[PDB]
Design a protein around this nucleic acid. Structure first.
Lengths: 48, 176, 120, 135, 82
RNA sequence: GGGGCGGUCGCCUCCUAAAAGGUAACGGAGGCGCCCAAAGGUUCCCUCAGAAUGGUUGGAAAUCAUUCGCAGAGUGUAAAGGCACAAGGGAGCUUGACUGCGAGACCUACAAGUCGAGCAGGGACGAAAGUCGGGCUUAGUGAUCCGGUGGUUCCGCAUGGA
RNA sequence: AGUCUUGGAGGUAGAGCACUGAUUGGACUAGGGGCCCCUACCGGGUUACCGAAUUCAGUCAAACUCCGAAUGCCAAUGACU
RNA sequence: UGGUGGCGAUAGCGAAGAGGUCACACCCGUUCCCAUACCGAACACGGAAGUUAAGCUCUUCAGCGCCGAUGGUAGUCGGGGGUUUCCCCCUGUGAGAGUAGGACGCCGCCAA
RNA sequence: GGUCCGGUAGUUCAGUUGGUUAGAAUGCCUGCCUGUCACGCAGGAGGUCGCGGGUUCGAGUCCCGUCCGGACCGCCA
RNA sequence: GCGCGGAUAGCUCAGUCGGUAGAGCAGGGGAUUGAAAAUCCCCGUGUCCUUGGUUCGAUUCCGAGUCCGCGCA
């Protein structure tokens, strides 16, 4: 079943992205490399 | 290698005189020997194929390929996705190496032997053989074998009719 | 006899597959190669009119080399067709391999064209 | 009682019948046949009763043909209800006879007994009919 | 007296979407104008005309639309600038 | 098609629908309140289902080999449309299931909904051309108020803070 | 706006079997009855007794369509009103 | 004769027959790029022993597939009737499964 | 006439939900005990799921329809 | 008039792809016993209440008639 996830980043705290995930398929805290507007560059994002 | 030399020297000339071929490279040629393992798996034990793979890599010279089931059928409790059977194709000098072992040591070492089947053909020059025992060449470590499922042997030639393959396999060395 | 497809016949599908994505117009013409087992050809094609601009091959009447089918000949024919582009200069060309794989004598032709100066 | 052993959907529209028959206009298999010359519906009870009146009188004369199958169902609401609130349950099978269609074909039988027998079978049908023979 | 019947369980159908030609042959059109609203590739686009996210045909340049045959059976749509 | 009782109330697909669009009924048939870290994105490469014949455990079909085979098979899921120059299948890499947008265009009472070239920043894949702002398209979903959470170069009742 | 010319989109009436279903006979047999005997029918001989699969010929379909108008619809250009 | 294109297969599927000095392709062997969820048929690798057998190109044919109007009809716009769940007359318009036949290729561009 | 229930070994009830195993008493058969029978004690089989159709690798158990029973309702004049 | 239901051995009852008429009781005979019954075995002569289609074959698959029982604003 699918849960919303709000993405966060270490290289800057303020992050915004909403995605979905299955708790069976990805129990582990997922990571993604994305473009933050305020860092004005592509950064690696965790979620909360 | 020896069989390649004899095939180049005498086999192909004899049959090309016999069928009176205008172009000498219309000669039928054995193309591929493929060895296909099949396990009656159906989720009984994972280690059956996990033994047959390294048994067949000892029977042949290289590692086989775990075949993939196409579709699920519950008539064996066969779920699609879990592995069944193994396959390996042999060509090059390797095919003549294997056919060498076959004719030289293997069929004489079968527990009982009469002549190979007269009409196991496809109708279009291919041949299929079914053997019941893994005891092909004697330096398999026979004490390690547990299951008794033998092997499936498929020789494919460029023969278009059954008769040319039938005649050529005689001088290859298949008893009939 | 088992049905072995012609290699060229299989090649046409891949060449049409790549040609569906790209084609060589005026002032942006298409590079074209041939990788016959004995010879390597190169052609420059304009599509909107169905005409060829420049071409080259290993069996040209000059600069023949005992390779004639190897990567040295590929580089030589590539820079040959580079000056063939140069005299009636286009100075630009899109790439189109002929259903081949960009590793070998085709690649030799490619960077032959590159260092001889046809901007991709 | 010619049952279509399976049917795609069980309720179709009643449709409208305009013009002459699409095919099977003339005698094709037998020598003498019976043709209808105006449009109506035709149902399995009628077709069975007609085939009885034909064949039982005909006894050992020869063989018969039917080139009509009552494939199309027709429904009806149950008796004494207010109309509306869903289509009614189907209860029977019908076929369309466009004018020009041949109904039944007779075989292996001389002309005059077939004549009077088709005439006898005509009264079972609710339609005006015409005798046609093979060309 | 009455008899009680119900349960039709059929009375639903979606709101039907508008699909079809929204420009005619020979129309002057503008850049970004849709030409045909299909659902699945009924007509492959030709030159100066793209293919949308839900298989929509949109004119990339202002020009005149032409409808043509593509192959044996299929249609093609194109824009010719004037 | 008097009320009660029964059934239904939103969204998606086809027919009814009268060869543009639209078009009702307690008219006829189904589905939806998801799922997919890949069942995406790029690059590269293929090709089905079924049948015939041989082959053992093994067959009516488990796994091989040949031949025929436009599409009968798939296309996450209902139907419809379309798809074998893949939109079907397989492999590597990766996160474009990005931000700021947006010429115009459809549809519409309004609220809404939908497509969209191209531009800017920063990417991914590929050598490149070029593709990528999720799924092959159409369903998989709700106003406002009020409250929670995170960031704020905003205001904060004399001023400075709160 | 009307009309003439011309360009389109669109699958209805019609028609049709190429698909999907239905459906009729001829032929044919896989295979299910058919009793006998050897007997585990091992098979033979088995009634046209039924009867899959092909072909020949024929019949229907709103949710079948290899086709498919008349009209209506959307336009362009010129001409007239 | 090879390369690449546009044209609805009137381009095909078939059946037969010819060609190879050149070109094209079968072939030779994986050593080093590269590869075979197993393999040099496949990817590439670098040669040239013989081979038109196939691929490919030409020659023939209407078996299949395809294209195909003429006059007939079915339908239908508009009028007008009738005993009117449907038929009929007229100005137009023109069905497809049917044949007359067409076709077993047409036009380029560069390298002989 | 409408709605809702169930349709399982010979009988009575679980399983019918867990799509991926068909079970429990009783009955019946055999053996033991008893002089014999009954109790009592050891052993054992059975149904392949009302029917038909559809989905899926696979339905007793999912979804329709047919049949059999049972419950409820069939009201206002 | 309608919808049903049946009528099958002397009696009570079964009897669906049509696959060569069934059970229990009853009767008789045999077994058992000193005899008898209880018990066991064997022995059925079934126009399946009439009229048609079909079939190699029809309580059977039906059709409509006869008799009786079950419900009808």
């Amino acid at each position: 079943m699918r849960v919303n996830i709000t993405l966060a980043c270490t290289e800057c705290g303020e992050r915004n992205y909403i995605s979905k995930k299955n708790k069976r398929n990805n129990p582990d805290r997922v990571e993604f490399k994305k473009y933050c507007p305020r860092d004005k560059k592509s950064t690696l994002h965790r979620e909360t | 290698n020896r069989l390649k030399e004899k095939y180049n020297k005498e086999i192909a000339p004899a049959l090309m005189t016999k069928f009176n071929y205008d172009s000498v490279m219309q000669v039928p040629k054995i193309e591929k020997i493929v060895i296909n393992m099949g396990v009656g798996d159906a989720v009984q034990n994972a280690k059956a194929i996990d033994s047959a793979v390294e048994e067949l890599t000892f029977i042949a010279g290289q590692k086989p390929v775990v075949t993939r089931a196409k579709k699920s059928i519950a008539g064996f409790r066969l779920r699609e996705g879990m592995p069944i059977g193994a396959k390996v194709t042999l060509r090059g000098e390797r095919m003549y190496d294997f056919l060498d072992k076959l004719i030289s040591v293997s069929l004489p070492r079968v527990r009982d032997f009469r002549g190979v089947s007269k009409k196991s053909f496809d109708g279009r020059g291919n041949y299929t053989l079914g053997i019941k025992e893994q005891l092909i060449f004697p330096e398999i470590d026979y004490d390690k074998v547990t299951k008794v499922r033998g092997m499936d042997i498929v020789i494919v030639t460029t023969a278009n009719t059954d008769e040319e393959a039938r005649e050529l396999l005689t001088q290859v060395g298949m008893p009939f | 006899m088992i049905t072995k497809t012609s290699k060229n016949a299989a090649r046409l599908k891949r060449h049409a597959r790549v040609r569906a994505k790209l084609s060589g117009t005026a002032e942006r013409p298409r590079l074209n190669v041939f990788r016959s087992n004995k010879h390597i050809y190169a052609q420059i094609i304009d599509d909107v009119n169905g005409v060829t601009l420049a071409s080259a091959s290993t069996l040209d009447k000059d600069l023949n080399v005992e390779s004639t089918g190897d990567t040295s000949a590929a580089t030589k024919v590539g820079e040959l067709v580079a000056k063939r582009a140069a005299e009636k200069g286009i100075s630009d060309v899109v790439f189109d391999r002929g259903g081949y794989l960009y590793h070998g004598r085709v690649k030799a032709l490619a960077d032959a064209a590159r260092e001889a100066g046809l901007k991709f | 009682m010619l049952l279509p052993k399976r049917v795609k959907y069980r309720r179709e529209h009643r449709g409208k019948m305009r013009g002459r028959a699409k095919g099977g206009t003339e005698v094709h298999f037998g020598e003498f046949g019976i043709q209808a010359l105006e449009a109506s519906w035709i149902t399995n009870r009628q077709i069975e009763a007609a085939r009885i009146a034909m064949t039982r009188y005909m006894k050992r004369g020869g063989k018969v043909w039917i080139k009509i199958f009552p494939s199309k169902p027709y429904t009806a609401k149950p008796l004494e209800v207010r109309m509306g609130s869903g289509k009614g349950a189907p209860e029977g099978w019908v076929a369309v006879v466009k004018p020009g269609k041949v109904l039944f074909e007779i075989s292996g039988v001389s002309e005059e007994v077939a004549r009077e027998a088709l005439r006898l079978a005509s009264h079972k049908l609710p339609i005006k009919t015409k005798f046609v023979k093979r060309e | 007296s009455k008899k009680g019947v119900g349960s039709t369980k059929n009375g639903r159908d979606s709101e039907a979407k508008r699909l079809g030609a929204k420009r005619a042959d020979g129309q002057f059109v503008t850049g970004g104008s849709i030409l045909y609203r299909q659902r699945g590739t009924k007509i492959y686009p030709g030159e100066n005309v793209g293919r949308g996210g839900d298989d929509t045909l949109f004119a990339k340049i202002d020009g005149t639309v032409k409808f043509e045959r593509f192959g044996r059976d299929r249609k093609k749509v194109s824009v010719y600038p004037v």
